[PDB]
Design a protein around this ligand. Structure first.
Ligand SMILES: [Ca+2]
Ligand SMILES: [Ca+2]
Lengths: 166, 510, 388, 388, 510
């Protein structure tokens, strides 16, 4: 029950083995990424294992999507029937139609949370990564320092717990 | 029928034309900059001339190592403290060199000019060479040294300690995660130009002073390759200088790059040098000021000034926090000695005198603490005392900066003592400076690195060590030690008897 | 000074006296083997493995990793420094791979350096011996300064296709092999160019510019489809493995081997040319070297993974099909090159004999490994269906 | 023990201190260049000249010697260890020679070592590439195994012709060059056997035994006069310079160059053989390397000696006439081999043109250097009489 | 279609067949023996593989020399006395190895079996390797050492002194002048086996003890080559054992070859070791006894008894001398110090104790003489005293053995001190023993080497030194010196002032 081997991990191991459907496993992954990844995750309860769990989960979805899609689909269709390129161009669209860094970052993180392989084919995903990621930076790094920490903390919406500076 | 041939230069002359145009002939990586496809590289080399000049270097290096140095028992006649220090220096530089392999591969993909790609390619191969060279140093000291433990398994025993995390930030993730240009700065523009290059030479000086002729033989060779890494970095700023984004994002990326690197190396390097040796070469203070302020933040950055490159706005901050950084950190590294993969020693009388002479005030603070820990038996397994306990007793929390991963103790530090805590979506975050805080506030998803106190929460100390293999071949004695002598070595049991259980320091604010 | 001012702990009496005094009577651990915890691919652990395995700091969540926790700094968006998300293939451990030639940086540059220096010596002898005389003028100024030359841009393209792998590879062993596969490719391309620069020096009027060979590659019809396949492998694939696989176990195995081994490695001599074959010997030696690595990775390691064997083969068969077609095209457009060859140079039974060798080798060294059911006659028919 | 028992003066505190104490403040002479007294052939003295020149303890009575007095122990009868009496050639200084490649032992075994390791790599790439498949069986089993095979004995014999020069050479620079010229020859002979051994491994039924090529050499017709010349050069010539000169500047420059380049190198390619040309590139590189040294010794130093120029040229012209006849006989007999080729392989015009090439190169690189009046047509005509 | 290649043994298996039969296929050199054409060799090498294994050794060697050893300033940190000894040791060995080049080429000519030729061949190249290696040591010490003089020009300054003449006998003329087999005995069966391998190792030991890591690096590599060489000497015996003449001549040649080597190397190697060093490894006598008497006088000589070989009939007188010969010789070498290309030192206080301890009676003989010479001012340039003067005043003529060239003073010696003077056809000849005397009586024409007294007769000392370039670059200071200190070095003028004029000691006889 430590760093690399623990009940929590063992739990999901057994929990994942029960997935006999691409749809189920695919959805679970989605819900897992919504519940345990990124700063916007729903909870930090699995902070010490979610990364290792998520992979054991991408695995199942990987194997299943394999023994389910046909070549053309495995290369162009998400494990959700979604048309990879469609979603891609669809997201880059909203990204470039973003008013500010706050809007931008919200799209990118959601994109990764929803279509991270084995959901979307890696080819499209990383192509998105280079497009979305680029835009995100452009907005963020523009007058990166202009805002004062006080204000920035407010914009980020953090809850200042303690401050000390001599 | 005169004997004739063609050299690399005569071929490279056509290398630029090797690349052609076509729809998606562009980078696969996110970047706010546009690398000019008309950019040239400095050295007109082809794969074959590259291999040759490197093979020649290899001959001398390995020749010295396998022959004369071995005959002179060079892997043994080095001071114990330094034998330990190299477990960290060599292996930590290894990952830095290794990640640099991916970073330059990424840069190579970023460049559109045939020559700029070729230039980065040379480094890809250089960084692989450097990974293997640093690996060889630990390999050699493991094979022929006074204490193989750590040298022989650093790749996995490194993961037990907190110092390793920060290394992955400056020389791993900071090398490949983010804008290719941002990664380029962390690597070549700031990392290598400001620290690595000078560091590499310095390491050879401290090594020689302590009887280590192994490291100079390897690092000086690595050093010869640096001239190209510098070339690549300078070319990065050139290939994007004429881009409108440059005047819009360069500096920010540079300042952030500068702070990122100095945040870790400022404390760590000075620590390794001054505390991981017996004989000293020069006070880390005069060294840092020369490297950072003079050379880099002046002579080097100044030359890029004609491209809009400005001095890091955090330079004032960095210097003000640097003075005691390394001294402040060793207290933490020693207090947490059981989590390492190397053995540490407390300053001896000459050293304490050396420290006080060079850093007035050192003894009244650090010196007295070390004498207290020692008199109390921090070196003796039978004392039942580990300095971490003293921090708990005197209510001196130790935090891990969520961004740079550098351990810090505001309540005790003679250096920076600012502490900023924030809660966000059910998770607490601790920061040690304003630059790192801003980096987090703006890019929350770029920094979610779990700290040791978070991963080891509630875990008993000897269990973490055992699980991560922090033991010697006898399965009982720890790799890490609070002294560098040959007797009275701490065993896993000695640690278990302590019943030290980790706690997430941030929760005290709940 | 004669002694210098810098005192060294190894030779300085005072300093070494201090060091010697601080030493333990014996090493503090009898285990003097670095990488002793690594699982040997062979009898005993090799220097290659010790120096390479686990150099990459992956955490356990990236199959094989031994570290723990997330990266310290990720990309804007959250993309990990390295992640499972950069390739479709899955494995129980990314550190399983092993370059059969056990090449770490030292042996690699040593071997290439020997070739470079020999190559030099050779050229100096070729020129001195005047063997150029017995060389058909046409072939020289045409099939070499144009068709062979133009091929350099092809090798350069496959070279560049390795960029992403260098960055995205999920382990030290794979990244090192990948880097060497790509590095060998730009080498060859530079060699092709070196010959032209040479021919220039010993054949007055011979232009070493890439102008012609490039123009031919960019606009020509000879390698037209070839270039299209290249640009695709290089710039349209974002999966570091799919790229390496498709490049070495498909395009270069088929088109590459044929162009190198069945066109120039089989014709240059007929036109009194032992020069070009000297360099092709290198490219071929390199091809065979790289091949042993590709097989171990994609077949011995991934294709035979005790957990994702089927899964991976499926992906490779898919990528195989995905790129077999563009490769076939590239070959066809190439077939249209013989038509430019003087009469009697080569019939159709031979051209057919060669094409069949490639496919058979390709099927035997690659296709059969992932059970990609191939049809030799159809492929050949398809490819061959483009002469004169 | 970890430290050992042996105390070393460089690292032992006590001993090193005693040593450092006895040291002078600075070097007792600032001339830190060994061999500074040697007259440099080039701009600055080379490592090659420093490590080599004057290593031979010749006294002043052997032109160029710096020592004095007779030898300490001579042969029964009185013959000196080294003496003027071992060669007809005379000079103002036997130490004037310089290998233009400046090869001392280290550079020599380094380049050969590079060539060796690459050869191994090449053979491995070659066998794995399966190129042996397209090589003509008759050419392989007949011309390579038997005729190319028999040529190894020719190279071996020429190697052996250097044995006495190794012993009698009147200077270190000549001894070294001569030794390397001879060593390169046995190397080529061993490479011919290596190829046969390689073929035995990748070709079912190919017998690597030397019995056949040896029987061809000792009892065949094609090489009869070549063998007779070799036996003569090696065992009937006691003058170490006549041997080296007649071998490289007459026999191997005419016969050797024709066989290696104008026959095997020229025709192997036509039979799908890229294997033999690989090794021939080595032999030709070596031939050209030796030629530079040979030209320096016999033309630059001796044939142009400021005192014995006329004399030495008379002697060398004498030797050229003496060995040109047996060499023509060797070429004449070798012409027989062409009648054994598959019809259409080559013709009388090509054969003639190729003879003219070797003869023209020979007249230019050698004959003309000593004003030896050679009639190219006369030589070729004499040789062609051997065509069946 | 599996990757395949061919190795050296695979080719070597057919090398024996390379040679073929023809009338004149016979040795061009005179010899009483017949070497069987079926004789095989120990190592199965081919040109390329020989090159590779030697190339590998060169890398380590030159790697060590060019890198670590150079960085450690190893060229300088050697005892002054040892720096000098190596001028003689490396250069003299250089010619031994060089003559071995021609010597083995002659054996290669003699052998008829392709394999036996090939064995000798590997040695011909090795001897070239060794010439260049010994040359490199002198080259390295001149470039990086404390006194380049002599190191930088021994090839011509060696000819001024008498110790050099004997060297050309044992390791030069004795290797190529005479019956090929006789020459092989001098070089291999006795030369290498008895003295040269054990010597090489001994030299590396003395070198290390005296701070020299240059010599061990090179000589230890030379040492690795001798494996194949020991094989050449053995098979030479095998190639002629089944020969009738063998029984009749083998033992006579062996005896002569044995005495030839011992006569010079015993006193000279012993001298260079004990008098040419500060730190001692072991007394020369026991270093000898082990070699010549045990390990070779029975261990190596007995093994070959199965071929008719026997024990050296002169071994008694040889042993009955290896005790004092070197001490006898140093007196002479020092007395004639101005005739060398190296600097010599009088034994110091500690040394005399060592000498007296390991050789009782040493002090009452040699010790007192050195003390007087010191009083006479032999070390001081203004004394106007050269130990040679002492021998003149005390009627102690110094003769040169017409055969071995070894200088001897019968009236003051403790080794073989039996002077024999003969007159033959208008010429005088002086012998120091009954073995050399027999050699000359039987082979007058083989030994006509003029000695230094004959050549220098009537010549003023300083003139000979000047004519033969025995000066340093300042064109004034002598290369040779009577002491090894950095100050007060003798100049040409200091010697001229002594007005020492050579005379042939044998002219006194009527
Ligand atoms: Ca006939
Ligand atoms: Ca008389």
């Amino acid at each position: 029950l430590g760093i690399h081997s623990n009940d929590t991990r063992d739990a999901w191991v057994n929990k994942i083995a029960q997935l006999n459907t691409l749809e189920k496993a695919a959805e679970m992954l989605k819900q897992f990424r919504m519940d345990h990844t990124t700063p916007f995750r729903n909870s930090y309860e699995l902070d010490n294992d979610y990364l290792w769990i998520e992979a054991k989960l991408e695995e199942k979805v990987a194997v299943l999507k394999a023994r389910a899609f046909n070549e053309v689909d495995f290369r162009h269709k998400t494990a959700f029937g979604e048309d990879a390129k469609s979603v891609l161009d669809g997201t880059v669209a909203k990204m470039n139609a973003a008013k500010d860094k706050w809007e931008a970052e919200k799209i990118h993180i959601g994109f990764r949370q929803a279509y991270k392989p084995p959901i979307m084919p890696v080819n499209y995903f990383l192509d998105g990564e280079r497009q979305l990621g680029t835009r995100l930076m452009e907005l963020r790094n523009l007058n990166y320092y202009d805002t004062p920490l006080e204000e920035l903390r407010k914009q980020r919406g953090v809850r200042v717990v303690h401050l000390q500076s001599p | 029928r005169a004997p004739t041939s063609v050299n690399a230069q005569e071929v490279h002359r056509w290398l630029q034309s090797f690349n052609w145009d076509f729809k998606n002939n562009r980078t696969k990586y996110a970047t706010k900059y546009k690398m000019a496809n008309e950019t040239k590289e400095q050295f007109k080399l082809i794969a074959k001339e590259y291999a040759r000049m490197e093979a020649v270097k290899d001959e001398r290096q390995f020749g010295s190592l396998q022959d004369a140095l071995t005959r002179l028992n060079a892997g043994v006649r080095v001071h114990p403290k330094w034998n330990e220090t190299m477990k960290v220096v060599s292996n930590f530089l290894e990952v830095g060199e290794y990640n640099a392999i991916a970073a330059t591969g990424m840069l190579w993909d970023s460049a559109q000019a045939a020559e700029q790609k070729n230039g980065y390619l040379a480094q890809v191969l250089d960084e692989i060479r450097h990974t293997h060279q640093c690996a060889y140093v630990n390999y050699y000291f493991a094979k022929n040294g006074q204490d193989p433990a750590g040298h022989n398994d650093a790749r996995r025993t490194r993961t037990i300690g907190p110092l390793w995390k920060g290394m992955k930030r400056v020389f791993s993730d900071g090398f490949i995660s983010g804008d290719a240009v941002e990664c380029s700065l962390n690597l070549q523009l700031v990392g290598e130009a400001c620290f690595t290059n000078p560091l590499i030479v310095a390491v050879t000086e401290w090594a020689a002073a302590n009887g280590d002729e192994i490291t100079p033989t390897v690092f000086l060779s690595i050093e010869t390759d640096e001239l190209r890494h510098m070339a690549n970095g300078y070319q990065t700023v050139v290939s994007i200088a004429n881009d409108p984004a440059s005047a819009k994002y360069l500096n920010t990326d540079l300042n952030n790059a500068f702070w990122t690197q100095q945040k870790y190396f400022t404390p760590v390097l000075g620590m390794l040098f001054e505390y991981g040796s017996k004989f000293k070469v020069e006070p880390w203070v005069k060294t840092w000021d020369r490297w950072v302020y003079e050379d880099w933040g002046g002579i080097w950055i100044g030359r890029l000034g004609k491209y809009g490159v400005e001095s890091p706005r955090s330079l004032k901050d960095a210097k003000q926090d640097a003075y005691w950084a390394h001294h402040d950190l060793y207290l933490l590294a020693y207090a947490l000695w059981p989590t390492g993969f190397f053995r540490l020693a407390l300053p001896d009388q000459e050293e304490m005198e050396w420290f006080e002479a060079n850093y007035p005030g050192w003894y009244d603070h650090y010196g007295k603490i070390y004498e207290e820990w020692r008199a109390r038996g921090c070196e003796d397994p039978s004392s039942g005392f580990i300095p971490l306990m003293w921090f708990i007793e005197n209510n001196h929390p130790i935090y891990i900066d969520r961004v740079s991963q550098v351990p810090f103790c505001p309540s005790l530090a003679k250096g920076a003592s600012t502490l900023r805590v924030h809660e966000y979506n059910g998770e607490m975050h601790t920061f040690s400076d304003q630059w790192g805080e801003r980096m987090w506030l703006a890019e929350p998803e770029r920094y979610e690195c779990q700290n040791i106190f978070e991963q080891y929460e509630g875990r008993e100390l000897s269990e973490v060590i055992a699980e991560l293999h922090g033991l010697r071949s006898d399965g009982k004695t720890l790799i890490a030690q609070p002294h560098v002598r040959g007797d009275k070595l701490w065993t896993l049991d000695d640690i278990k008897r302590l019943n030290c259980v980790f706690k997430n320091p941030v929760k005290a604010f709940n | 000074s004669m002694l210098g001012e810098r005192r060294r702990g190894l030779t300085d009496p005072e300093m070494a006296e201090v060091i010697l005094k601080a030493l333990p009577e014996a090493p503090l651990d009898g285990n003097n083997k670095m990488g002793y915890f690594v699982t040997p691919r062979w009898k005993r652990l090799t220097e290659y493995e010790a120096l390479t395995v686990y150099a990459q700091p992956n955490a356990d969540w990236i199959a094989g990793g031994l570290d723990w926790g997330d990266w310290t700094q990720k990309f804007h968006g959250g993309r990990p420094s390295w992640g499972n998300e950069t390739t479709e293939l899955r494995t129980v451990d990314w550190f399983k791979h092993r370059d059969p030639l056990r090449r770490w940086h030292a042996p690699y540059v040593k071997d290439k350096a020997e070739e470079w220096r020999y190559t030099d010596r050779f050229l100096q002898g070729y020129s001195a011996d005047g063997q150029i005389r017995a060389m058909n003028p046409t072939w020289r100024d045409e099939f070499i300064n144009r068709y062979w030359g133009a091929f350099l841009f092809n090798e350069y393209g496959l070279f560049n296709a390795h960029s992403q792998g260098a960055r995205e590879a999920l382990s030290d062993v794979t990244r090192v092999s990948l880097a060497f596969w790509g590095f060998d490719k730009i080498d060859i391309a530079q060699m092709i160019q070196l010959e032209r620069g040479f021919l220039a020096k010993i054949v007055p009027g011979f232009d070493e510019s890439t102008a012609v060979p490039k123009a031919e590659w960019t606009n020509g019809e000879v390698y037209k489809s070839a270039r299209l396949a290249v640009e695709g492998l290089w710039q349209e694939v974002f999966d570091w493995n799919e790229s390496a696989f498709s490049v070495h176990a498909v395009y270069d195995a088929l088109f590459g081997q044929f162009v190198r081994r069945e066109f120039f490695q089989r014709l240059a001599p007929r036109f009194g040319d032992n020069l070009t074959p000297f360099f092709i010997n290198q490219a071929q030696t390199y091809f065979q070297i790289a091949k042993q690595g590709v097989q171990d990775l994609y077949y011995n390691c991934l294709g035979d993974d005790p957990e994702f064997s089927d899964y991976n083969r499926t992906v490779m068969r898919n990528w195989t099909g995905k790129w077999l077609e563009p490769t076939i095209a590239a070959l066809r457009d190439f077939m249209g090159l013989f038509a430019k060859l003087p009469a009697g140079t080569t019939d159709k039974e031979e051209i057919t004999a060669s094409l069949y060798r490639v496919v058979d080798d390709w099927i035997e060294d690659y296709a059969s490994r992932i059970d990609f059911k191939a049809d030799r006659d159809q492929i050949v028919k398809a490819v061959l269906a483009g002469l004169k």
